Design a protein around this ligand. Structure first.
Ligand SMILES: [Ca+2]
Ligand SMILES: [Ca+2]
Length: 680
């Protein structure tokens, strides 16, 4: 324990747990009947893991001697109590079919049980991340109100309404998606889960209120579900909401396929105020180390493009697998591959996540074979020791949390990457081959001339290397499945910014800066050109309040009282004011070719009349259909705004609406909807 950092997870090791399948700490809170499967023989029903389960693993040391520092759990909220019609008889085991975002899942525990978890975590220096699924409710049939629980939504016990007879319009009624488009996937039902209508005021206040209730329990971060299923506008406004309240590390899950790259996803991580699960890394690692569909070359381009795709790559959440994929380990598979991926992940950029049981070599392909009940608590396996060693390095060498990545050597087989932050450096070499061997010559490093023992202690037949003149490393052999890790750390005395969190705020919010060379004597901090009042200074970390600057993006520099000034940390965003989700609708907006409609206006959130920063393209198929376009935008509340719509080509062309500006006074503490006509 100590001063936990809710907005800086770069130095953490995450352990993702699906509650139901971990440990059954309290058998008395077990469900019975068709909801329960004794022995977990049927993986689609409740098996029994509850919160007590977890506190036991925290207290008996399994998690803590592993080097785990943060725990990620299922959505704690009350789920539906009905069973599915399917062959299996599917229950809400996974905590994804919410019923009431304001009460606990009684199978997992009470509210108090809940509080004992966080605390049990806290006392031992372990952060807590909870799943939160604001997109939908539960599986429903409009036409068959008997189906499950009609996707019923409760408010602390009181009903709001179901999918059938939605007088209120709490949900969407545009069929389910086909994933034919981004739009298709937001305003349509993900499968048959009842899709919440975030534009609705009741809904918008209800979800925002709930998140708060949980934060109040003292969690440390949130993991958002079906990130590419909610609008964008609304989500940004929710992030505005948590930040004003009490900043917590938040990240969304935008599933990406094996060779998938999507600029929209890039944009989401960069602008929403929330970071993202790193699928590109995920899938990519999977290719080279488990699928043999790619090599290091791919991996390397992956790393390079990734650092340029994301403004804060350091904020991405990494993994070799999760609740949603086929476990890394296959039956009959080679367990050392796991060890290898683990060693790779723990030393890579981004916040590293380990899926429960990875360290036990658990197997299972597809849902729900990928969610068996925790097999063993064997603390002696190779996987576990590698986490042990690497978790300590990561806690120790800053290059791991904040350094960039440089390729020092590579074969389709051999990859030797370097991590550096200031003088801090960690060198890593891996031979993925099972049979070919190599002799690493002409290897060059940032490590100070010397002798280095493998940071693994030879767990993967790691060697001792020697650094001579000119950063030249002495030739050495690298056999099949070999992994060696060498690090160098030293005091800094030049101000270096390692991380900034959050990356979004209002005037007067609290921003935390992490680094080195800050110096014990409090200096000065700047946002662009303005000095920021500081609340606390240390050579490692400084907390400051955003100065009173104009809305926009600013660079952050650090100047020690000795005059040194740090390189800047880019893109801190200062928002005009409290955000609200507004639905901008435009009628009779006909178009050409690639031509699309956008929105631009007089406020920062709407680009300040710069068509290069216009919001869009706008939607025109679901809620409204072309020639009518719509979009949900996050914008300042209680503000009279001016905006116009524009048609933008494939290659830049801009066609303005041709008359006076459209005016509108954005609502306060709630959503708004505005519809106008394209002024020809
Ligand atoms: Ca139980
Ligand atoms: Ca949706």
């Amino acid at each position: 324990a100590g001063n936990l950092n809710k907005v800086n997870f770069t130095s953490d090791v995450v352990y993702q747990i699906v509650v139901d399948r971990f440990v059954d700490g309290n058998t008395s809170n077990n469900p019975s009947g068709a909801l329960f499967s004794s022995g977990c023989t049927n993986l689609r029903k409740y098996c029994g893991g509850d919160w007590q389960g977890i506190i036991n693993k925290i207290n008996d040391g399994y998690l803590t001697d592993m080097g785990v520092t943060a725990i990620w759990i299922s959505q704690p909220v009350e789920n539906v109590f009905s069973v599915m019609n399917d062959a299996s008889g599917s229950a809400s085991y996974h905590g994804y079919w919410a019923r009431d975002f304001k009460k606990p899942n009684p199978f997992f525990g009470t509210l108090s049980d809940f509080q004992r978890l966080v605390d049990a975590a806290h006392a031992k220096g372990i952060k807590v991340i909870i799943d939160f699924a604001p997109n939908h409710t539960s599986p429903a049939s409009e036409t068959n109100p008997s189906y499950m629980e009609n996707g019923r939504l409760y408010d602390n016990g009181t009903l709001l309404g179901g999918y059938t007879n939605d007088a209120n319009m709490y949900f969407h009624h545009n069929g389910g998606t086909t994933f034919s488009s981004l739009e298709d996937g937001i305003y349509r039902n993900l499968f048959d889960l009842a899709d919440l209508n975030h534009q609705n005021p009741v809904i918008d206040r209800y979800l925002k209120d709930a998140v708060k209730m949980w934060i109040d329990m003292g969690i440390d971060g949130i993991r958002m579900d079906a990130v590419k299923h909610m609008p964008f506008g609304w989500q940004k406004s929710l992030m505005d909401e948590i930040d004003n309240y009490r900043p917590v590390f938040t990240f969304g899950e935008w599933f990406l396929s094996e060779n998938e790259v999507d600029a929209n996803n890039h944009y989401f991580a960069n602008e929403s105020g929330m970071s993202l699960l790193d699928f590109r890394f995920g899938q990519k690692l999977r290719q080279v180390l488990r699928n043999n569909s790619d090599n290091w070359y791919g991996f390397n381009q992956m790393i390079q493009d990734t650092a340029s795709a994301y403004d804060e790559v350091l904020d991405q959440v990494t993994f070799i697998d999760n609740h949603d994929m086929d476990r890394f380990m296959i039956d009959g598979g080679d367990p050392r591959k796991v060890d290898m991926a683990l060693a790779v992940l723990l030393t890579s950029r981004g916040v590293p996540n380990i899926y429960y049981g990875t360290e036990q070599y658990m197997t299972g392909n597809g849902d729900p074979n990928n969610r068996k009940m925790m097999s063993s608590f064997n603390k002696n396996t190779r996987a576990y020791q590698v986490i042990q060693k690497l978790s300590s390095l990561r806690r120790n060498n800053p290059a791991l949390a904040y350094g960039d990545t440089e390729q020092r050597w590579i074969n389709g087989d051999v990859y030797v990457y370097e991590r550096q932050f200031g003088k801090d450096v960690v060198l890593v070499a891996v031979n993925r081959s099972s049979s070919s061997n190599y002799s690493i010559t002409g290897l060059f490093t940032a490590l100070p001339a010397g002798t280095y023992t493998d940071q693994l202690g030879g767990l993967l037949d790691g060697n001792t290397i020697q650094v001579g003149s000119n950063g030249s490393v002495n030739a050495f052999d690298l056999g099949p499945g070999e992994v060696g890790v060498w690090a160098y750390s030293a005091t800094e005395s030049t101000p270096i910014i390692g991380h900034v969190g959050p990356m979004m705020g209002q005037v007067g919010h609290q921003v935390t800066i992490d680094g080195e060379g800050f110096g014990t004597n409090t200096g000065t901090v700047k946002f662009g050109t303005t000095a920021a009042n500081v609340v606390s200074w240390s050579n490692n970390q400084i907390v400051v309040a955003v100065p009173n600057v104009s809305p926009g993006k600013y660079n952050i520099t650090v100047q020690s009282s000795s005059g040194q000034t740090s390189a800047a940390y880019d893109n801190f965003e200062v928002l005009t004011n409290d955000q609200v989700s507004v639905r901008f609708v435009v009628n009779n907006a006909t178009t050409n070719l690639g031509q699309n409609i956008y929105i631009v206006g007089n406020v920062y959130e709407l680009g300040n009349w710069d068509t290069s920063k216009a919001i869009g393209p706008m939607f025109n198929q679901v809620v409204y259909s072309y020639p009518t376009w719509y979009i949900d935008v996050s914008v300042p509340e209680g503000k009279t705004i001016e905006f116009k719509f524009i048609k933008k080509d494939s290659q830049g062309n801009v066609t303005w609406e041709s008359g006076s500006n459209h005016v509108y006074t954005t609502p306060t503490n709630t959503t708004g909807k505005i519809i106008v006509d394209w002024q020809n």
